[PDB]
Amino acid sequence: ITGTSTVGVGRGVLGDQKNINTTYSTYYYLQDNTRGNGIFTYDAKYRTTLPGSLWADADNQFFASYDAPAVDAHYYAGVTYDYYKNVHNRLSYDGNNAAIRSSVHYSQGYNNAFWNGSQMVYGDGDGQTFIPLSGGIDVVAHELTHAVTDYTAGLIYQNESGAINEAISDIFGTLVEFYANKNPDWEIGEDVYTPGISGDSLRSMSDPAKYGDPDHYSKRYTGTQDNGGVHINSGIINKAAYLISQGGTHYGVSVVGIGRDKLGKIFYRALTQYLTPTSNFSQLRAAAVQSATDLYGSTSQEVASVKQAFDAVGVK
Numbered sequence: 680i681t682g683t684s685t686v687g688v689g690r691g692v693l694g695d696q697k698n699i700n701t702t703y704s705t706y707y708y709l710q711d712n713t714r715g716n717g718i719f720t721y722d723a724k725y726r727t728t729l730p731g732s733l734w735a736d737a738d739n740q741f742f743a744s745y746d747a748p749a750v751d752a753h754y755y756a757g758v759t760y761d762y763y764k765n766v767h768n769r770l771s772y773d774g775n776n777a778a779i780r781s782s783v784h785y786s787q788g789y790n791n792a793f794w795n796g797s798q799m800v801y802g803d804g805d806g807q808t809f810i811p812l813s814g815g816i817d818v819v820a821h822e823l824t825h826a827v828t829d830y831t832a833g834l835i836y837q838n839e840s841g842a843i844n845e846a847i848s849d850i851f852g853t854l855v856e857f858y859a860n861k862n863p864d865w866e867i868g869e870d871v872y873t874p875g876i877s878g879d880s881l882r883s884m885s886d887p888a889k890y891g892d893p894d895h896y897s898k899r900y901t902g903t904q905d906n907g908g909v910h911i912n913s914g915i916i917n918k919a920a921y922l923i924s925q926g927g928t929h930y931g932v933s934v935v936g937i938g939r940d941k942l943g944k945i946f947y948r949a950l951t952q953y954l955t956p957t958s959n960f961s962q963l964r965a966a967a968v969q970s971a972t973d974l975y976g977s978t979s980q981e982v983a984s985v986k987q988a989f990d991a992v993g994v995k
């Protein structure tokens with residue numbers, strides 16, 4: 680909408696106060712004009728019609744319980760935009776400052792969030808398995824990274840290419856979580872998963888087997904569930920990325936860690952310059968090796984660590 684840029688204040692899903700960029704025109708809208716061609720947050724009003732209504736508020740204060748998922752979807756989209764711009768010199772998900780659109784209060788009791796090809800969509804959860812999913816910065820960044828992938832490598836969402844697509848979203852979701860530097864970790868969705876249980880999440884990158892996911896190619900799932908295991912076999916790549924960053928010895932193979940910033944540079948370059956819609960895990964290894972070679976040289980520690988990490992998870 681056309682209107683002047685304003686600064687509202689509210690509370691997110693976890694009760695934390697934060698400022699949000701809004702737009703004033705009769706109402707205050709969740710429209711952030713400070714980033715690209717805008718960040719826009721919508722109310723789906725417990726229905727499944729999308730996007731729903733651009734979020735309108737009478738007084739620019741967002742402290743109602745019903746407001747909290749919208750506050751966080753809007754704010755964490757901004758953090759994710761900042762990460763890609765400041766760390767990777769990428770302007771929004773398409774590299775040309777596309778407007779970022781999110782809808783909250785999707786459906787009733789909806790225990791998921793997703794990117795639908797055009798926008799981010801967040802359920803409220805059922806209160807037991809999930810609370811509103813935009814409360815997790817890693818979840819928000821995971822979803823927006825699917826948009827980046829769809830404008831770059833275009834990894835098909837099935838079998839090994841789909842597992843790479845998922846791992847890329849977990850990797851950059853986690854790197855955004857570290858960038859914001861509140862309570863960062865290598866697990867996925869802990870802030871919004873199972874409010875009655877401490878310490879758990881949907882997936883672990885440091886130990887995928889904690890939640891039943893493979894941590895070695897010999898344990899890959901080859902059935903048809905979950906688009907051929909895209910959220911299952913992502914563990915093999917998540918573990919490799921964890922090892923590249925943090926190091927460790929896994930199934931007897933030692934990896935020298937090179938840290939999060941270099942992990943991000945290597946995988947961002949692989950995503951944008953080497954991967955294609957049909958890339959498999961072995962092609963991902965090759966893309967990461969060549970990306971690290973471009974950045975650091977063929978004889979570098981960084982290239983050696985990429986090779987060790989893919990060796991450790993059985994990807995040749």
Ligand SMILES: N[C@@H](CC(=O)O)C(=O)O
Nearest residue numbers: 791792793794821822825
């Ligand atoms: N981010 C979504 C991807 C999808 O729409 O399948 C999810 O991982 O649940």
Ligand SMILES: N[C@@H](CC(=O)O)C(=O)O
Nearest residue numbers: 791792793818821868910
């Ligand atoms: N954290 C993401 C990943 C997934 O869907 O599996 C989400 O809840 O969508």
Ligand SMILES: [Ca+2]
Nearest residue numbers: 736738740741
């Ligand atoms: Ca209000």
Ligand SMILES: [Ca+2]
Nearest residue numbers: 862863864869
């Ligand atoms: Ca965390």
Ligand SMILES: [Ca+2]
Nearest residue numbers: 817866867868
């Ligand atoms: Ca996390």
Ligand SMILES: [Ca+2]
Nearest residue numbers: 872873874876
């Ligand atoms: Ca929990």
Ligand code: NA
Nearest residue numbers: 792793794825
């Ligand atoms: Na999705």
Ligand code: NA
Nearest residue numbers: 825826828829
């Ligand atoms: Na995608």
Ligand code: NA
Nearest residue numbers: 881890891892
């Ligand atoms: Na699991």
Ligand code: NA
Nearest residue numbers: 955957958962
């Ligand atoms: Na390929």
Ligand SMILES: [Zn+2]
Nearest residue numbers: 821825845848
């Ligand atoms: Zn995903």
